[PDB]
Design a protein around this ligand. Structure first.
Ligand SMILES: *C/C=C1/C(=C/c2[nH]c(/C=C3[NH+]=C(/C=C4\NC(=O)C(C=C)=C4C)C(C)=C\3CCC(=O)O)c(CCC(=O)O)c2C)NC(=O)[C@H]1C
Ligand SMILES: *C/C=C1/C(=C/c2[nH]c(/C=C3[NH+]=C(/C=C4\NC(=O)C(C=C)=C4C)C(C)=C\3CCC(=O)O)c(CCC(=O)O)c2C)NC(=O)[C@H]1C
Ligand SMILES: [Cl-]
Ligand SMILES: [Cl-]
Ligand SMILES: [Cl-]
Ligand SMILES: [Cl-]
Ligand code: NI
Ligand code: NI
Lengths: 322, 322
């Protein structure tokens, strides 16, 4: 039951401190991480409504010829497919993805919130692709684990092999929202977090709520400044643009400072949701900035949903055995 | 508890009839389907030991310069990766896959059985690739189904949308190994199989056993003649080559005739395995020959494993509710 949100900073809201941080509106920061570009567009006309200020870098055109243009003119072969994939009223977690050939390779991810389309562009390399075999072969390791703790251990090992992150943890929530690191895979030489417990305030209630609905989030560079959207309010509504479903969403500054204090250069986590409840997180750290490729991110998200069912079977089974 | 196998035809075994078909050694036919090529190689040296007779068509070289050559000479950039992915003693269901650029596009799938590597080559198109989003977006439909029958219905619909097959069924086994079509998605105009029940003999006991360990099999063209391996016995062992893990494995002639009698041009199914037991099949038909691309096959296999956990949760839940 999260408390109501403060207005965001660009609407005159208060500065966030350790006394009020449960009220930070982390889903509407009005800004993005600088390794990609974001546009929003009207879901019926395709008119481009908002754009991140760095969009000319990634899209090779100044906003003058971008704002107010339609996606039918900018993305003529993707526009019909985009409409078919994200019809009105669809879930905001549903996504459309394409790989564009831009005068290099741009990855395009789209989702729909109400009557708005949110388009994320980020550079990708030809060798950055990941086939379905990555997930397929990983399912064998997970199904042979004999109990819940063994399942957690093999899961962290599997995620570290797929990604190369310096540290991968399984963080389990207790009934009071405190957490414990119940499994960990880490680079040789890094100190262990295995078995450590943390207070509920390190992941506040409005973050836990968001993480029950949008399953993956990341900070690619913990010392990068965010890039504003322009205009900052959605012209359709005269209200903030919901970015909870955008991986390019700017991270809370409170969390960015937390990560820097830990010596973390890049961070990523995936929700494990069991029976509609946030059960835990697959939590990853790198010592330097690192952008995990889009195909590998989607694989990790799918692995999280698999792990959720495996947890739910084991918990059901060792509850039914009693 | 399947009865012991007859020797295969090329070892002097008897002809298979409706009186003895539970003894057909379907895993060692000594032949493959003609839309791809197969090689076997020593798992340590990489020496090429057996090849399908059509291999020169797909590999552009006569067997004279193929047999006895090493994979280090033929596939110099794949050979080291192949060894790392399939170490001695690994599961025979574990697979390695690459996309080769051949003087067009060849898909390469490798698995290991004992000390033998089995390599399958098949042509593929650049537009035949399937990203991880296909499986990711399909998971949403499956998790919202309220009960087991609804889960079956949405699953068949999802598989038909991904593949375009004329008919997709969910076939559930009863405790006596008879089966029932409990859900079906089909092209407009095709008669329904929904609700029909079939005898246990249509999928005999040795097929059910094989299908508990190797989860996907297909017949791309129900009127295509199979292509022999040469030599037909594995020189390592002087014994038949196990092909249960090869999708190119020739289909039982008894089943090929069954399919032709039904008017089926192409067939494919995926096992649903629950608690180590064969629970049912996702069974697909096309009216004409059709080779589903390798990336889409692996996606269907992963969807089958997902469905198995969803079935196991629902059955556990509505057994626990009682
Ligand atoms: C007063 C507010 C505070 C606060 C806010 C906050 N924290 C997050 C997100 C996360 N916190 C995490 C905690 C940990 N990471 C670790 O490595 C460990 C132990 C080794 C802990 C306990 C995690 C994993 C997240 C999720 C994000 C990620 O994976 O990096 C947010 C939300 C960030 C966002 O999504 O924008 C917020 C607002 N944390 C505090 O400690 C207090 C000061
Ligand atoms: C005397 C032996 C017989 C026999 C053998 C046999 N059958 C299979 C495999 C399958 N049979 C299937 C049955 C059905 N397909 C349908 O569409 C329906 C109802 C609409 C049924 C009952 C299926 C689905 C399979 C799996 C393969 C596939 O998906 O096409 C085998 C094994 C084939 C192989 O893997 O090599 C064998 C040996 N079937 C008989 O009816 C008797 C005559
Ligand atoms: Cl809080
Ligand atoms: Cl109970
Ligand atoms: Cl039988
Ligand atoms: Cl009970
Ligand atoms: Ni019971
Ligand atoms: Ni109970």
């Amino acid at each position: 039951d999260p408390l109501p949100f403060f207005p965001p900073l660009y609407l005159g809201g208060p500065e966030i401190t350790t006394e009020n941080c449960e009220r930070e509106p982390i889903h509407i920061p009005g800004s993005i991480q600088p390794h990609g570009a974001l546009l929003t567009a009207d879901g019926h006309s395709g008119e481009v409504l908002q754009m991140s200020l760095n969009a000319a870098t990634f899209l090779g055109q100044e906003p003058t010829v971008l704002r107010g243009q339609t996606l039918a003119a900018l993305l003529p072969e993707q526009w019909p497919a985009l409409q078919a994939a994200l019809p009105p009223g669809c879930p905001d977690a549903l996504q459309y993805r394409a790989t564009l050939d831009w005068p290099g390779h741009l990855s395009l991810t789209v989702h729909r919130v109400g009557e708005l389309l949110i388009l994320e562009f980020e550079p990708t390399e030809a060798w950055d692709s990941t086939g379905p075999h990555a997930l397929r072969n990983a399912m064998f390791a997970l199904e042979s684990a004999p109990n819940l703790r063994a399942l957690a251990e093999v899961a962290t090992q599997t995620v570290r092999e797929l990604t190369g992150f310096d540290r991968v943890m399984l963080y389990k929530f207790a009934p009071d929202a405190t957490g414990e690191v119940i499994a960990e895979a880490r680079r040789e030489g890094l100190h262990a977090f295995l078995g450590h417990r943390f207070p509920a305030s390190d992941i506040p209630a409005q973050a836990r709520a968001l993480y029950t609905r949008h399953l993956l989030r990341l900070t690619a560079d913990t010392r990068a400044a965010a890039v504003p959207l322009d205009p900052v309010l959605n012209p359709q509504t005269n209200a903030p643009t919901p970015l909870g479903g955008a991986v390019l969403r700017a991270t809370s500054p409170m969390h960015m400072q937390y990560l820097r204090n830990m010596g973390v250069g890049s961070s990523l986590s995936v929700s494990v949701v069991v029976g509609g409840q946030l059960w835990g997180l697959i939590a990853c750290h790198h010592q330097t900035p690192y952008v995990l490729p889009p195909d590998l991110r989607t694989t990790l998200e799918s692995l999280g949903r698999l792990l959720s069912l495996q947890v739910q079977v084991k918990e059901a089974h060792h509850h039914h055995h009693h």
